[PDB]
Amino acid sequence: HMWHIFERFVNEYERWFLVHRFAYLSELQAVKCLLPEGRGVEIGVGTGRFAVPLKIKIGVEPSERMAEIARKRGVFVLKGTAENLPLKDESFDFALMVTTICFVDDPERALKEAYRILKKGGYLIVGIVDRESFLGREYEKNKEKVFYKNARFFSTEELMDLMRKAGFEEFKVVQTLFKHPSELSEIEPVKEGYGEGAFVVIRGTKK
Numbered sequence: 001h002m003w004h005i006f007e008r009f010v011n012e013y014e015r016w017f018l019v020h021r022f023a024y025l026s027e028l029q030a031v032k033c034l035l036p037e038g039r040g041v042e043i044g045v046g047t048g049r050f051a052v053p054l055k056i057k058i059g060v061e062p063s064e065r066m067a068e069i070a071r072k073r074g075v076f077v078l079k080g081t082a083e084n085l086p087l088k089d090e091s092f093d094f095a096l097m098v099t100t101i102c103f104v105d106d107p108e109r110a111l112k113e114a115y116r117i118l119k120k121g122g123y124l125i126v127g128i129v130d131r132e133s134f135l136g137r138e139y140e141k142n143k144e145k146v147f148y149k150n151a152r153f154f155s156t157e158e159l160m161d162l163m164r165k166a167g168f169e170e171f172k173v174v175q176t177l178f179k180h181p182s183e184l185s186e187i188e189p190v191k192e193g194y195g196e197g198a199f200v201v202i203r204g205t206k207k
């Protein structure tokens, strides 16, 4: 269970957000571009770093240590994994996964579960570092060197294919992080598409 790593290095995980604040805000902003109205759930809500600023009230998380931090920050968190969502069929308008699908045990199953819990017309928003980006190449090359040794890296197109095979359609993509996170002194802009920025956000529709 790759997710165990986040229990084990929770303080290191949180540090990232303080050390790389502008990259974090860039990512939030990219997610915020494709976030719809209605009732959302964050799958793999971690310590609430996305749910809290995005005003997502419900989250699912397997790590008790992480869940407790999210709970203190105001998120209502159900214990569970992406592959077995403790949620009813067609009960959400959207679902969000930010740097979660890379650490699930079964990405295909996790996308099927997301499909299940969404209402007709609902949306799945997935954020990833694109394997095929300057930054993706670096993380992958240096994976054997905490979070990524057992991570699975996705290209944007690989992730879309999987989402399409889980039942999603009418994809919309945005991108950000054109500079390295260690050299940001301001928020990075968001643009449509993919191929240029390291962080990509993809929305699919359950029609």
Ligand code: NA
Pocket: 043, 044, 045, 046, 097, 098, 099, 100
């Ligand atoms: Na996550």
